[PDB]
Each structure stands twice: as C-alpha cells, then as structure tokens.
Design a protein. Sequence first.
Lengths: 50, 51
Amino acid sequence: VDSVSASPDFVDFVPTIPMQEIWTLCSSEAQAEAMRKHYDDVWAPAQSEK
Amino acid sequence: TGQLSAEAKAKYGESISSFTQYSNTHQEVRGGDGAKAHGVFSGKKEDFQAW
C-alpha cells in the first residue's frame, strides 16, 4: 500500500471522458472522415469479432 | 424330547449432519488519501484515526 501511494498504476477509466478517437487529432476532415468511415465500417467490426 | 432355540436380531442406524456458513462484507471509503483509507479496513482505531 505504501508503494501504491508512491507508484500507482493505471487501473480504471474516468467514465465521463475515458478516451478520444485518434482521428480527432487528424490534420484534415477528408482524412479524418476516411479514418472514421473505415473504423466504423471495417476495423471495429473486425476487432469486436476478433 | 426335542429342543430348539432360534433368535434373530437386527439393528439399523443412520445419522446425517449438515453445516453451512456464509459471510459477506463490503466496505468503502472516500476522501483523505487512499493508502490511509485502506487502513480503516483493519477496524483498528489508530488506523481509523490515521485516516
């Protein structure tokens, strides 16, 4: 417990804003939409299946 | 003149015992610091005071 006070590790999310989509960080709406569209249509289905 | 003796004996015993114990405990603490907060789960006053 003393070590946890000195060196806590990531254990859980803040449930209000846990993570942000990476294409929010994109330079450009065309790229960002392409990433979102591919994420929605292809990658997230595959990973949820995987 | 004839003699006969006959005996039959039977005994039966059955015994059944059952025991069951179940415990549940839930503790939660907010505020202070979490490391001292874990201390109150000892139930020991000095650790409660330390929290």
